[PDB]
Amino acid sequence: FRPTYGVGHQPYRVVVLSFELLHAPATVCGPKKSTNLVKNKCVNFNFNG
Amino acid sequence: DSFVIRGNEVSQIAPGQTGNIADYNYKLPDDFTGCVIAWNSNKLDSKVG
């Protein structure tokens, strides 16, 4: 690799993500959005499901 | 998976696409699932000469 090549000849670092979906015991997921708590009003809640 | 390829072969990492980066180096299936990421890096992988 040289710093003067045409774009098609300079290097490219590359990374590919591949993962199974056989629905095996879940190992990865990341929302977990948490809202501030409200008290003394009848409110719709979702506590860990 | 991580590796470095030329800048005209980046396209070769795709399901069942022919070329010279997915013919004898490494090839992924045609029913592949996931994502791919590439970025031209010419300031750390390209020297003068």
Epitope: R2, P3, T4 | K47, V48, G49
Partner: antibody
Amino acid sequence: EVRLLESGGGLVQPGGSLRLSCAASGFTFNDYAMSWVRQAPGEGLEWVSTISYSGGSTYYADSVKGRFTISRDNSKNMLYLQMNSLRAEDTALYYCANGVATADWYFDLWGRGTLVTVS
Amino acid sequence: QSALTQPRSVSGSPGQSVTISCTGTSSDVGGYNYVSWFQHHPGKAPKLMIYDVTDRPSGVPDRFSGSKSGNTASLTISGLQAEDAADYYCCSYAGTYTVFGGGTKLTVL
């Protein structure tokens, strides 16, 4: 990223004294040997001097021994060449180089060079 | 020479701003984005203030800034201090060579 910068050229009189400097950037200066290579008008490239990554090892070319002194300050990422008894055959463009991407003893990274003129 | 064209001299008053221009050819400034700016006092090594047209290396205040348009690069120094007085060189890495401008001596009166 990785850059080499030569410095310290100017007009000096024959038998005079000069200090060259080389400024490293984008890599671990103290992990790598540094060398000075010059190119005098009409002549090919000439290796002048090499200093190891530490500073405890200095190598010089026969054509300039005694009169040339290579040095490095690993705290400041700077390389130096002290040229004394400067002669006319020392007029040249001066380069510092190292082997960050190949090996310690090679010159793969280069500066553009600084011009030293001996009247 | 073939160096990038810089002013030979620029003057500014301390605390004020000064802009320095650097015009080259289609093989250097207008070829790649590998343009550097250097502070220099003859007899000592330049200190890298700008590499990567607009990015500052370590230890250089944001008073020094860089820009590019076409084959012309521009350095701007804000908040001039007496110690900013020096020679300033633009610089371009072009693959097969690096090339400096002829330099601008900045005097802070």
